[PDB]
Design a binder for this molecule. Sequence first.
Ligand SMILES: Cc1ncc(C[n+]2c([C@@H](O)CCC(=O)O)sc(CCOP(=O)(O)OP(=O)(O)O)c2C)c(N)n1
Ligand SMILES: Cc1ncc(C[n+]2c([C@@H](O)CCC(=O)O)sc(CCOP(=O)(O)OP(=O)(O)O)c2C)c(N)n1
Ligand SMILES: Cc1ncc(C[n+]2c([C@@H](O)CCC(=O)O)sc(CCOP(=O)(O)OP(=O)(O)O)c2C)c(N)n1
Ligand SMILES: [Mg+2]
Ligand SMILES: [Mg+2]
Ligand SMILES: [Mg+2]
Ligand SMILES: [Mg+2]
Ligand SMILES: [Mg+2]
Ligand SMILES: [Mg+2]
Lengths: 579, 579, 579
Amino acid sequence: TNHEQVLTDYLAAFIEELVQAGVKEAIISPGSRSTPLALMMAEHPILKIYVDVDERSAGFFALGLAKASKRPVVLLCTSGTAAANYFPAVAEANLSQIPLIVLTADRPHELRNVGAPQAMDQLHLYGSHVKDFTDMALPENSEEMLRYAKWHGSRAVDIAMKTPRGPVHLNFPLREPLVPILEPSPFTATGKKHHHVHIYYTHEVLDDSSIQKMVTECTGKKGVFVVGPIDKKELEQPMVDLAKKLGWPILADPLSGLRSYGALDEVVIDQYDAFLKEAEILDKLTPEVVIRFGSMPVSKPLKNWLEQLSDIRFYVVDPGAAWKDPIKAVTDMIHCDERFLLDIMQQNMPDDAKDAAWLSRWTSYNKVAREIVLAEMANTTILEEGKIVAELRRLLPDKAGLFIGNSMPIRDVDTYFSQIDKKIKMLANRGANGIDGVVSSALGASVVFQPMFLLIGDLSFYHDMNGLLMAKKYKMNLTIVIVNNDGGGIFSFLPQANEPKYFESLFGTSTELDFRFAAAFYDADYHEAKSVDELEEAIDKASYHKGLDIIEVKTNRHENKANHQALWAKIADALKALN
Amino acid sequence: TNHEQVLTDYLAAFIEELVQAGVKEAIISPGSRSTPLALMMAEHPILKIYVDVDERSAGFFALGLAKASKRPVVLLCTSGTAAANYFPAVAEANLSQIPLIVLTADRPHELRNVGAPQAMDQLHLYGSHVKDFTDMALPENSEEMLRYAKWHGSRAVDIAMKTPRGPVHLNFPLREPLVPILEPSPFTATGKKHHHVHIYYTHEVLDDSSIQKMVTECTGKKGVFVVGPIDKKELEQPMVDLAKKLGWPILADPLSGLRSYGALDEVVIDQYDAFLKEAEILDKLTPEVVIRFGSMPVSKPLKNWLEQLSDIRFYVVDPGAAWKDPIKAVTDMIHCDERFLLDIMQQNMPDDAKDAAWLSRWTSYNKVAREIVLAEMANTTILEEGKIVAELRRLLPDKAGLFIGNSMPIRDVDTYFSQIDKKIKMLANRGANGIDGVVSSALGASVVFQPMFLLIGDLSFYHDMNGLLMAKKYKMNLTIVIVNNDGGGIFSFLPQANEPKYFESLFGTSTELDFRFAAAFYDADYHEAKSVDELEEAIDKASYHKGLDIIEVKTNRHENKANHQALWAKIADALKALN
Amino acid sequence: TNHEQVLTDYLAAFIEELVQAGVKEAIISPGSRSTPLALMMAEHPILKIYVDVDERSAGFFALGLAKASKRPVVLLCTSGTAAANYFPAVAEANLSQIPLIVLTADRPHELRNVGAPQAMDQLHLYGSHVKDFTDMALPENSEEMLRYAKWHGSRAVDIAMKTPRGPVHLNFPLREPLVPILEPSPFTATGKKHHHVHIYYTHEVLDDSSIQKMVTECTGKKGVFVVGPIDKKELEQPMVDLAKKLGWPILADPLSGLRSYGALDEVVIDQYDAFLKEAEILDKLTPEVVIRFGSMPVSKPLKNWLEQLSDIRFYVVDPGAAWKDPIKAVTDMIHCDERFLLDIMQQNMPDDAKDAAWLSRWTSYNKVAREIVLAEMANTTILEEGKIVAELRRLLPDKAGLFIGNSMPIRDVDTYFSQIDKKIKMLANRGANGIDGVVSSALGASVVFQPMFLLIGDLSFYHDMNGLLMAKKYKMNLTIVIVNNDGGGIFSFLPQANEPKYFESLFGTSTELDFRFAAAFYDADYHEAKSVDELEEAIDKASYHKGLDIIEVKTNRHENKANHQALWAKIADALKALN
Ligand SMILES: Cc1ncc(C[n+]2c([C@@H](O)CCC(=O)O)sc(CCOP(=O)(O)OP(=O)(O)O)c2C)c(N)n1
Ligand SMILES: Cc1ncc(C[n+]2c([C@@H](O)CCC(=O)O)sc(CCOP(=O)(O)OP(=O)(O)O)c2C)c(N)n1
Ligand SMILES: Cc1ncc(C[n+]2c([C@@H](O)CCC(=O)O)sc(CCOP(=O)(O)OP(=O)(O)O)c2C)c(N)n1
Ligand SMILES: [Mg+2]
Ligand SMILES: [Mg+2]
Ligand SMILES: [Mg+2]
Ligand SMILES: [Mg+2]
Ligand SMILES: [Mg+2]
Ligand SMILES: [Mg+2]
């Protein structure tokens, strides 16, 4: 009868089901309405909790932790504008297919839409950016209601985790009193037995008729793989193996894993962004079959090349039917597991069909472009942005995670990160390509991969400085390389940089913050790199420090276009006279 | 034919209409998609622009500027997660009825829902938190399309500004190239003439039959006014005048303006939160008529008193039919201008009907409670939270604006800000009562009222430190008093403070940040007050500094409940033996 | 340049893609805005068109045609309230997983939300009841825009057809002039070549670890199959074969196909609704494993039995993760093809594990209940509702389709349709269980199965009489048996039938329509059955008539409960003394 007991039984059934369905970490924000749910998550012995007071930074922290661990992560906040702060992470979880279980407390029906304090319409709050929305019942400890609480915990994880993965949103109207009964413990097998809903491991498969068609239309064709941002693990070697058994180049995004899976290989192309610009070379590269994996790669020239390819079989491997194809060039859509596709083609495609002139065409351009790029970077003392990427490529340990901010860092890794023989798990928020939350994302990922590193421009670092409070609070290890060009450097390349009247105020926002002060605020070892060996020293000192390190490299925004154009011409001119 | 010319003509018609409809300030965030709209806002000679790179802080900066100026303010951001960051300010603009014109650029239809970079579903992005949503056409310079662009500029402002005011959301799909033609100037009467849509000044009025009913049922009744957060200006004196001509007390929220309109008066009650707790006094205070103005006041005891009033005429003056009544006690709903109501009752209610024992009952309790509170604060040297409010009440200039953060600052002003004879415009984000964005809000309001002051707890200050970048960038004057109790002090009062096992991790989040470092980051004069005269010195130094000042006062969270209970008992015991 | 040519190129690319993706039939409603789309669908040589002027009846006609053919069906209507009429069919397509491509024309952006005639907000018109919504671009014949039109045609079908199937909604803003250019033909290979997007056949599969778990936990267990409304064809025999190789009864809904797949068998239970009511028998029937297929069966007693089963492994086979489980009893969720599951268990489960007492328990009750039911019906001359179902079971041809209305027809088929050795495809709108649109649904299904028959109560027949205009217009063959009890007979069973004061006005709405007149209106051969051989004659005459026949059987509403209770007691009393 006690409302506190009814409140306890209800939430205990929901949270226990969540944990047993695979949720191991809950990112909680402080509130009064969320009191019963947050207290019960604490009383769980198996669930790990991270408290973050900024609801925006909390969301991207769950985002990155779920990105890196591949497991479901619970967010929990109070009612009011707190839930609204989750919206940027939710939008990026949706586009980037991350399983977040968004729990938001709310006022009960009597305090809804009546002008009550700290109460807003939380119904369908995130719209189409969640896979499912549920407005839970007011707590009841009835038999059917305890089974309904458990039923929803199982449902929520399963939908979040089901291909294509994405965020899920449960709203909890909660009436006062809000203090549950934590003694005796609501869990710990201290009474009733749970009824966990086991979900079985299922995956999509190509039909045997479709397998034979796929194999037939791809035999002996001059083919090309395009692997953009991918996530499904252990697909690096199988892809390389199938590429070698056909004689096909893989144009590989940095976020594919292929530029850093632990070995060197000939099929991976990492300088396509460099040479797909030169028209006099494009004629010898024309394919007959493209097979895209994962998301669209970062490279704009590659996109414009794929766009203008006529008379071609353009396969797109989209498990879960997300229809991510911004050039709208698809000719054959394959709705099945990527693991399965690589495997049934490895065992069915002919090993004999190999035009060696085809792969030799691609690899030649690449090996030459790659070493002209590594040359100009090896013979420079100016710590320009290309050099930073170069030097991080050399200095990073094996088994090291690298989070990359959007804007210019993500593009420079494309140009200046050729393939290395280290396993370097690479992460980037590439759903909406937002500069918000990259600090909090890299922090959550640092829960999973260590050593963790973050390359990030200055504006994005300011945008999410509050994430660093988590590093201070939880004693996390992250090594942030801030490329401080004082503004938005990416805008110097776009055509708005010609007219200087309204520039700088708009694009390229001079900020003039001494990030030394921000590092003392969050108790971070701060280093400023001026030379090449200055940076070497810092990465080195950062390897002994189990904690937050921040390494600033001041660069000039207005020279970046010149160095990039000068280098691309050296690659274009070389490749232009290469037959 | 030129797409650039078509892009220019379209947006010029829309923005010119906005400016002529009353928009004088545009808060812009940097982006590539928003390039044409942001460039054209720059080429406007009359429109003032503020650039803020944090889209969340940009929104609350528009919120407060529109709060304080009472005029429409444009927000403009690029596509992607940038628009999602506006959502907390939008939610608070909706609940607090602020006219924000939210403009969000987007990719054109071909790049929508196809996996294009930095593109998300921006359709009905903010849901029910906007008054109107519009997905604009792709730019066209046709006659009908130029009139449609102008038609929407006029419509958008008018809906935003129409009672009940609130945010409005226009989405702009924009196809590349995105660089408009700014020379010759698209405005400046350099060609065509505009067709501005004049909107006429309209206001709701009570019918003459309803006037006679209102007057009749309220004559000679033992009545009480409840003015919570109000905004409509120049209603302070008329309310006080009508209260005196009936012999009725006004229970006045700090955000009503009545505790600081420039004069002292007997009808305003500012200690209701103190004495509505003592049951032995409530019997002599029972009213027969309540007339509520504006939002629900902050005070919980007052709410619980109004809730338990049976057999009473509970008028609620809600212009624009927003139905803000969390106790659901309304007996008569009045849908008309508050100015009009005060005026037709001033000229129609009988001057003779006055039971002096009624007002003497209320004013006595108040004058005694008020001076016991000012006594305990005048005779203390510990800069506890009550004292800070006391001392700011004494030290604040006339014609000074005071922004107040949520959580504990807003409640302490209720207890420790009796009425003063200065004009002190008081502001607080009281829609969703969020601790996010209070720094950015106070900053935007500082564009309007000077000198501007901000009282704020520590967590809320950390939550929106990025707002201070605006102060650095635009050289604004703000004097922030941070009440740093290291965590959430408001949670020590709630019943979750008894169980210490899971406290502190959840409620009351120890943060341990030296805000000295955050003040150097944003070039802010920093002062730490330990004594009473230390704070006096700082407010004083802050009055010469045209710039950002930050004044920290460390307080103990775990003593706050004791001082508040000790003081409330002194008021209860006194008032208990007072007849 | 010609807008007519641009309009033609755009829509030709979209419709051709639709046809090549599998759409063979378009159900069009007349309008001015839909003129370009409806004219072009006519100029297609392969697409069959059915015009229906009632937009509500048009939708259920597409519903049933897509239900029976298992293929995608296009709906097309004009702007305004016409699209709103699609909403009931859309809601039922969503719940019942039918692939409908809902195309709704609209006014262009300039005529949107401006008070233009016949224009309403068609954005997200059907909300969460569609799988996907798209607001198409204004027509453009650009390269990218022609590929975008085609891209969306392919996407729309694929999402509709992808498990779990459901409706899809494309909105088309169309600017005047609206007359396309049909000569020379936009299709017929009269110019350009198309680029069809082949989608490959994919299906979910259980992992090999999950297969071994499934097989292990189900070996030798006293198990039971529950097959409610199913649709995936050719699963009747495999299910029966797996049931026989385990010694497990199949509780089979009429809409499963199992009561009429062409043969007789012992594993199918068709009288569970009869005997799951008797408590003294339920103890001997307690299972250890339930494996549910398809939707929830109609039977309420079965649902209440499954609800109260404790300590049991409750498998639910839900391909596409729809989570349809109204008792919330699931213990193991299987997200894979039903075909696959029946097949991997046929080849892995042990043939030896068979407790014959288990199946003998179920089959005995069933064979006895079944023949007591067929006895009482064989020895009656009153054409009560049980008898009608009995006599249709005997008189229906092989290879005959039977559409069943909701309310009381669907329940009587459950009680009075034991298994027969004919192939009788059985259909019912069981998503939202609506009595609207059953005439139009059965009509569309009659496009696929012939001879087609429809059993329907009187109110539902009146609810969708307008569907019969399609039968008149297109010369279709349907034989409607109207069980006219003059009102809602289903309400005499519910507890509201005890209080007669407000009955009849509300539940059980006496209508008093002579349906003879409605049959002349739609040129339908009308027969009224009074005796058993009267009905035999009519079904017989109806078999020579290639056309619309309507056969009324007047029944008494207030006797139905008595006959049903009397019969259920004969079954309960018999089964009570049967060991
Ligand atoms: C929340 C939000 N709001 C605004 C933007 C727009 N936006 C960008 C997109 O164009 C980047 C798309 C991409 O990378 O694909 S980049 C950018 C400046 C970033 O400066 P930085 O971090 O110092 O980096 P660097 O100066 O380039 O070295 C902005 C402001 C955004 N992305 N997200
Ligand atoms: C965005 C968001 N997310 C979470 C909360 C919950 N919430 C509060 C509401 O209960 C305050 C409702 C109110 O004031 O009416 S107060 C609070 C702590 C504030 O600490 P402070 O600023 O240092 O102040 P002090 O410690 O009290 O001196 C939190 C975290 C919120 N309001 N908004
Ligand atoms: C559109 C809509 N609106 C109202 C109803 C409510 N409703 C019913 C549901 O309870 C039937 C749920 C079910 O079958 O599961 S049955 C019913 C009367 C039907 O009378 P009839 O066709 O003459 O049949 P008979 O009298 O039983 O022989 C109504 C009016 C509805 N279903 N759909
Ligand atoms: Mg714990
Ligand atoms: Mg930068
Ligand atoms: Mg200007
Ligand atoms: Mg505080
Ligand atoms: Mg035709
Ligand atoms: Mg009937």
